[PDB]
Amino acid sequence: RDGVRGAQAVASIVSFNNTAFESYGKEQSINAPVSQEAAFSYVTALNYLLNPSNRQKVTIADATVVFWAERSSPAEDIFAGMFDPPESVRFHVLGLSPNAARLSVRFWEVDTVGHMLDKVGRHYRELEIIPQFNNEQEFPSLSTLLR
RNA sequence: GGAUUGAAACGCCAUGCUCAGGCUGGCGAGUGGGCGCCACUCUCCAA
Question: Could you tell me the distance in Å between the CA of residue A128 and the C1' of nucleotide B23?
Answer without folding.
Answer: 41
